[PDB]
C-alpha cells in the first residue's frame, strides 16, 4: 500500500526506484507525491540494483523525499461486460458519458494471445456496405483487414461514418436464418479534435445506430500513452463480444498515423536505434501485434472485421506507415485526389485498389452468379477508357474510331453514375443493375469475359 519509497534519479520520463525485487517486468505502478495526485507507470527493464519506471503523463512536481510508487496488479487488463452496447468510453477505459460507471463480468488482459493457425477457418461470407465500387469490385468479407488509404484534405472520417451507419450482413441472399446474426460497431478514434468529435457524436446519435455500438475517444490533448492504449482496449472488447457472445463486430480505427507518431515519440525517449525516417525498428512488429487480432475461428460463429483508416503523409505510398500496413493487411482500398476535384463522392479510384479475399466471398450461390464476371468486365472497360483518354489527351481526337468512342462514353458515364453516389444506400442488387445498365452501352459480343448465359438473361 505504502511500499517502495527511496527513489534515486528522475530525468524526463524515467524514474529509478531502488531496491525492489517484487515488481515483475512490465507491471503497473502508481506514483503518488506530496500533494496527493496519483499518476501511472510501467516497470520496464527491471534489474537487481534498481528498477526503471516510465511515467505516463508528466514528471512535474516530483521529489526524491516525498514520493512513493506502489504495485497495482501483475499485468494490464480492463473489466469488460455486455451492457456497454450504447455506451461511450475514453482511452484507458473510463466512462465519459451521462450514465454511471459499469460493472464487470470478468476483466481480461489487453495484449497478445495470438490465434493458433490450426484453429481458424477461411473467411467465406460477405458484408454489404452500400457503396457501389466497394460492394461490386472490392467486396469486403467477414473476417479480413482492409485499410482505406486517405489523404490530407480528403473526406475519410465521413466515409467511415457512412460505412458504420449503413453496413449490414445480408442473411437472405446465400442462405441461413434471417434474424440470427447480431451486429455491432466498436468505433475507436485517436488524435481527433473537437470538431471531428462533435461530428461523430451527432452523426452517430441521429439515426440511433448508437444502440448497437461502443465508442472509444482519445481527443488530441491527452498524454500519448492513452493514444497507444486505445486500439488494444477496443480489440479486447471486440474479441470478447465476438468469440463469447456470438456477435459480428466491425472495428474501425481512425488515424493510424497519429498512433505511429505517438509510438515514435514514446519510443525515441529510450535511445533505441531509430530504424527508418524516425520510427523505430519494431514498428512492423507492433502494427502486426494489433492487426492480426481479427479473424474467424472454427467451432464458434462470431467474427471480427477491421477497416483501419489511415492518411498517407504526403501522398507517398513509399512511406514507412503505408508500407508496413500494406505488408500486414490483405487488400487495400485507396481514395483518389483527382476525382475529388471534379466533385465526386466517395472519391475512390478503382485502378490501384483490390481485395485478396474477394473471389471466395462471391459467386455461385453467394450473392449472384454474375459478380466476378461483371467485376472483371467493369475493370477491363474502365482500363481501356483510361487508355484511350490518355491517348487522346496526348495527341488529339482527330483520328479516333468506333470502338474507342464506345469506351470513352463508357468511362465518362461510369465515372459520373457508378462512383458518384452522394448519401444514397444502394443494395447490391441495385449496384449490379446499374452495372448492367452501364454495360448495355457496349455491343454484345465485344465483352470477351462474361459468359453467354447471363448475357442472355440480362443486358
Amino acid at each position: 500500500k505504502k511500499e517502495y519509497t527511496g527513489i534515486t534519479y528522475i530525468s524526463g520520463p524515467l524514474l529509478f526506484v531502488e531496491n525492489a525485487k517484487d515488481l515483475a517486468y512490465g507491471a503497473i505502478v502508481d506514483i503518488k507525491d506530496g500533494t496527493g495526485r496519483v499518476r501511472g507507470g510501467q516497470v520496464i527493464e527491471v534489474s537487481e540494483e534498481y528498477a526503471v519506471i516510465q511515467v505516463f503523463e508528466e514528471t512535474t512536481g516530483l521529489d526524491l523525499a516525498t514520493t512513493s510508487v506502489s504495485l497495482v496488479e501483475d499485468v494490464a487488463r480492463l473489466g469488460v461486460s455486455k451492457e456497454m452496447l450504447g455506451r461511450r468510453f475514453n482511452g484507458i477505459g473510463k466512462p465519459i458519458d451521462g450514465l454511471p460507471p459499469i460493472t464487470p463480468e470478468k476483466r481480461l488482459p489487453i495484449t497478445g494471445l495470438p490465434l493458433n493457425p490450426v484453429a481458424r477457418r477461411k473467411p467465406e461470407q460477405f458484408i454489404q456496405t452500400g457503396i457501389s465500387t466497394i460492394d461490386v469490385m472490392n467486396t469486403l468479407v467477414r473476417g479480413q483487414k482492409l485499410p482505406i488509404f486517405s489523404g490530407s484534405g480528403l473526406p475519410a472520417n465521413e466515409i467511415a461514418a457512412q460505412i458504420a451507419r449503413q453496413a449490414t450482413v445480408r442473411p437472405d441472399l446465400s442462405g441461413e436464418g434471417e434474424k440470427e446474426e447480431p451486429f455491432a460497431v466498436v468505433f475507436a478514434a485517436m488524435g481527433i479534435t473537437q470538431r471531428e468529435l462533435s461530428y461523430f457524436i451527432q452523426e452517430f446519435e441521429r439515426t440511433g445506430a448508437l444502440s448497437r455500438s461502443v465508442l472509444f475517444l482519445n481527443k488530441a490533448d491527452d498524454p500519448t500513452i492513452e493514444r497507444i492504449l486505445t486500439p488494444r482496449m477496443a480489440l479486447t472488447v471486440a474479441e470478447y463480444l465476438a468469440f463469447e457472445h456470438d456477435y459480428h463486430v466491425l472495428v474501425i480505427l481512425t488515424d493510424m498515423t497519429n498512433y505511429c507518431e505517438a509510438l515514435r515519440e514514446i519510443g525515441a525517449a529510450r535511445e533505441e536505434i531509430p530504424g527508418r525516417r524516425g520510427y523505430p525498428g519494431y514498428m512492423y512488429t507492433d502494427l502486426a501485434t494489433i492487426y492480426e487480432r481479427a479473424g474467424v475461428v472454427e467451432g464458434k460463429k462470431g467474427s471480427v472485421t477491421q477497416i483501419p483508416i489511415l492518411s498517407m503523409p504526403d501522398d507517398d505510398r513509399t512511406h514507412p506507415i503505408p508500407d508496413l500496413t500494406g505488408y500486414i493487411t490483405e487488400g487495400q482500398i485507396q481514395l483518389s485526389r483527382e476525382l475529388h476535384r471534379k466533385g465526386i463522392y466517395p472519391p475512390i479510384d478503382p485502378l490501384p485498389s483490390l481485395s485478396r479475399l474477394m473471389n471466395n466471398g462471391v459467386g455461385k450461390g453467394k450473392t449472384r452468379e454474375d459478380h466476378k464476371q461483371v467485376s472483371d468486365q467493369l475493370y477491363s472497360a474502365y482500363a481501356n477508357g483510361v487508355d484511350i483518354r490518355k491517348l487522346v489527351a496526348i495527341i488529339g481526337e482527330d483520328a479516333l474510331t468506333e470502338n474507342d468512342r464506345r469506351y470513352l462514353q463508357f468511362a465518362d458515364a461510369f465515372e459520373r453514375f457508378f462512383i458518384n453516389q452522394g448519401q444514397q444506400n444502394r443494395s447490391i442488387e441495385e449496384s449490379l443493375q446499374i452495372a448492367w445498365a452501364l454495360l448495355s452501352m457496349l455491343p454484345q459480343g465485344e465483352l470477351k469475359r462474361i459468359s453467354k448465359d447471363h448475357i442472355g438473361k440480362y443486358y
Binding site: 525485487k21 512490465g26 490450426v118 481458424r120 477461411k122 527508418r276 492480426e292 505488408y327
Partner: protein, 577 residues
C-alpha cells in the same frame, strides 16, 4: 547441470548470475516455468540468455537451469503432413490440449511416441556399419522412410530386432561398443550435415509457370530470390510453386507471413492430388509456421529448423525444395537481438554479420551424392521484401552475389493487373546455358534457338515502344507496327498466366513450346504478307488471332490436336491473302 538465478530482465533478453561453465550457444530453461533460451555471451560468471517466449512477468530470483545441448531437432519418421512451431512443437497437439490460444511454457514432444510402424531389417549380425549407412526401412504414406546411422557413429552390429511393429522409442540395432540405435536421432541446427562430394546441377526444376520455366530457369540444385514491393503476388507465386512443382517433398517455411496463408494451405491441400503418385497433396508437405504475432527469435529458430529438415530428407535420397519466406523478417529479428546486446551497428541498423549468415544459409543448398551413395538435391527459393520496394536494402544486396536466378517483381505490372508481375527486363538466370543438353534431349531439338527469337523480339520491341509512346502508333512503318502487335500478343498470350483457373495453372514444356512455335509462325508469315503488299488492317483481324489467343486455356490431354489444327489454319488463312 549448472543452476543459477536471474539478475536482470530487459525485453527478450535475460541475464543469469552464478553461471560458471555455461558453454556458449547452449539451451537453458529460464524461469519457474521453462522458457527455453540460448546463451550468446559470457561475462565473468554470468550469461546473456535470449529467451524464445513472451518473457513478460518474470521476477528477479527465479532459477535458471542449463542443459548443455545446443538447440537440437528431432529427425525421424512421422514428420510429413503436419505443422510445427519454430522450436518444432506440434501445433495440432498444442491446440488440442490447451485451447485455441497459443500458450507459453507448454512442452510437447516433437515426434509421436505412441504410433507403431512396420520395421524391416536390412542388416545381419556381425556386419560393419558406419555413419550414413541404412539399417532398414519403415513405410509412410506412399514413401519408404529409411533409418540411417547418425553421422559420425561407427562400430559392429551385434543384434537386430526381427521384423514386426515397434514404436519410436525402441532401440532396434545394438552395436558392439554398447550404444543403442533407435528409430530417430537428434542433430544440432547450426551445423551442416556432412556429405561425400557436391555435384553440379544439370536438370531443370520445373515449376509450371511459363516465364520461370522458359525465360529464367533454375537447375534442380540451385537458388533464387523473389524481391518486390507489397501487393505484387509473391505469396501466390510461392504457393503455386509449392502445389505444382516437380519435387518429391516440399518444406514451406514462413517467418513473418500472416497466418491466413498458413490456414489457406492447411485447409486447401488435403483435397488436392500429388501429380506424381496420386495421393493427397498434404502427404508431401512439412510446412513450418511462425506468424507475425508470435515471438520474435523463433523466426531464426524456424529458418534453421527448416534447412535442417531439408538436409535430412536430402540425405535419405529424395529431392526436396525448401521455400523460405521473408528473410527480411529474419534480418529484422537479428537486428532486434543485436540492439538488445547493445553493439555497434552497420548500414541501416543491421549488425555487420548479416552477409555471413545469409551466405551460410544459402550455401547449404545444392545437389549432392550422400554417404549412402544415392543422390539428392535441395533447392531454395528465398523471398525478400525491401522496405520501400527499392532493391538497395542490405538484405537484398547481400542476397545477390550469392544466388543463381533472380525474379524481380514490379509494381507497375502488379497494378495493371498483369499478374505474375515478373519484370523480364531486369531479371536473369545463370542456369540457362547448362540446361541446353537436357532441353535438346527431352523437349525439342531446336528449342534453344526458338527461345532466343522470343527474347530478342521483346528486347527490340521495347525500344520501338519508346517512340510509340512518343508519336503514337500512327507514323510507325509496317515493320514497327507488326513488331508492336506481335509484342502485345506475346505479352498477353504467353507470358501472362492466371493461377486461379482449373486448367491454365500448369503449362507443360511441350505446351509452352507449342505456343512459342505458333507465335513465331504467325510473325514470319505476317512479315511475308506485309512484304508482298497487304496492309495491317487486313493482317490483324483474322479469326486465327483469337484462335491462338485462347491457346493457353486448352488442356494437356488435347493440346496437340488443337495445335495441329491451328497451325494448318495459319497455313491456310495466310495463303489466300
Amino acid at each position: 547441470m549448472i543452476q543459477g538465478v536471474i539478475q536482470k530482465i530487459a525485453g527478450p533478453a535475460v541475464i543469469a548470475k552464478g553461471m560458471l561453465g555455461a558453454r556458449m550457444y547452449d539451451i537453458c530453461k529460464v524461469g519457474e516455468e521453462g522458457l527455453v533460451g540460448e546463451i550468446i555471451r559470457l561475462d565473468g560468471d554470468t550469461a546473456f540468455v535470449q529467451v524464445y517466449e513472451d518473457t513478460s512477468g518474470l521476477k528477479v530470483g527465479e532459477p535458471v537451469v542449463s542443459t548443455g545441448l545446443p538447440l537440437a531437432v528431432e529427425l525421424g519418421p512421422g514428420m510429413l503432413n503436419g505443422i510445427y512451431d519454430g522450436i518444432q512443437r506440434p501445433l495440432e497437439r498444442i491446440r488440442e490440449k490447451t485451447g485455441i490460444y497459443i500458450t507459453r511454457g507448454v512442452v510437447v514432444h516433437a515426434l509421436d511416441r505412441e504410433k507403431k510402424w512396420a520395421w524391416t531389417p536390412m542388416v545381419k549380425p556381425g556386419d560393419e556399419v558406419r555413419g550414413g549407412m541404412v539399417l532398414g526401412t519403415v513405410p509412410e504414406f506412399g514413401f519408404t522412410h529409411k533409418i540411417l546411422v547418425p553421422p559420425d557413429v561407427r562400430g559392429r552390429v551385434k543384434e537386430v530386432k526381427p521384423a514386426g511393429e515397434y514404436t519410436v522409442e525402441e532401440p532396434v540395432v545394438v552395436l558392439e561398443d554398447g550404444t543403442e540405435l533407435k528409430m530417430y536421432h537428434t542433430w544440432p541446427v547450426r551445423r551442416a550435415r556432412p556429405v561425400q562430394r557436391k555435384l553440379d546441377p544439370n536438370t531443370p526444376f520445373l515449376t509450371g509457370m511459363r516465364i520461370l520455366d522458359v525465360l529464367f530457369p533454375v537447375a534442380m540444385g540451385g537458388t533464387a530470390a523473389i524481391p518486390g514491393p507489397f501487393g505484387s503476388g509473391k505469396t501466390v507465386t510461392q504457393q503455386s510453386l509449392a502445389k505444382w512443382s516437380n519435387a518429391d517433398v516440399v518444406v514451406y517455411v514462413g517467418c513473418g507471413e500472416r497466418g491466413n496463408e498458413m490456414t489457406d494451405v492447411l485447409v486447401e491441400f488435403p483435397e488436392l492430388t500429388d501429380p506424381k503418385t496420386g495421393g493427397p497433396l498434404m502427404h508431401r508437405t512439412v510446412l513450418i509456421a511462425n506468424t507475425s504475432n508470435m515471438p520474435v527469435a523463433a523466426r531464426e529458430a524456424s529458418i534453421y529448423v527448416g534447412v535442417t529438415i531439408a538436409e535430412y530428407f536430402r540425405d535419405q535420397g529424395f529431392s526436396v525444395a525448401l521455400m523460405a519466406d521473408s528473410t527480411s523478417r529474419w534480418a529484422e529479428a537479428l537486428r532486434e537481438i543485436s540492439s538488445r546486446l547493445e553493439e555497434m551497428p552497420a548500414e541501416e541498423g543491421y549488425p555487420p554479420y548479416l552477409a555471413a549468415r545469409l551466405a551460410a544459409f544459402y550455401e547449404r543448398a545444392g545437389k549432392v551424392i550422400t554417404l549412402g551413395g544415392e543422390e539428392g538435391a535441395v533447392t531454395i527459393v528465398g523471398a525478400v521484401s525491401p522496405p520501400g520496394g527499392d532493391m538497395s536494402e542490405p538484405v537484398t544486396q547481400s542476397t545477390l552475389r550469392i544466388v543463381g536466378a533472380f525474379w524481380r517483381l514490379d509494381a507497375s505490372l502488379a497494378f495493371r493487373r498483369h499478374f505474375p508481375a515478373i519484370n523480364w527486363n531486369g531479371s536473369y538466370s545463370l542456369f540457362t546455358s547448362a540446361l541446353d543438353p537436357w532441353y535438346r534431349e527431352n523437349v525439342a531439338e531446336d528449342y534453344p534457338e526458338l527461345r532466343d527469337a522470343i527474347s530478342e523480339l521483346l528486347q527490340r520491341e521495347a525500344g520501338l515502344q519508346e517512340i510509340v509512346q512518343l508519336v503514337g502508333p500512327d507514323a510507325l512503318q509496317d515493320a514497327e507496327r507488326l513488331v508492336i502487335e506481335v509484342g502485345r500478343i506475346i505479352r498477353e498470350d504467353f507470358l501472362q498466366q492466371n493461377a486461379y483457373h482449373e486448367v491454365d495453372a500448369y503449362c507443360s514444356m511441350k505446351k509452352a513450346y507449342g505456343i512459342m512455335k505458333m507465335i513465331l509462325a504467325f510473325y514470319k508469315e505476317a512479315e511475308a504478307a506485309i512484304k508482298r503488299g497487304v496492309s495491317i488492317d487486313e493482317i490483324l483481324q483474322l479469326p486465327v488471332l483469337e484462335r491462338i489467343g485462347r491457346a493457353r486455356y486448352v488442356s494437356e490431354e488435347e493440346f496437340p490436336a488443337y495445335f495441329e489444327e491451328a497451325m494448318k489454319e495459319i497455313q491456310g488463312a495466310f495463303k489466300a491473302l
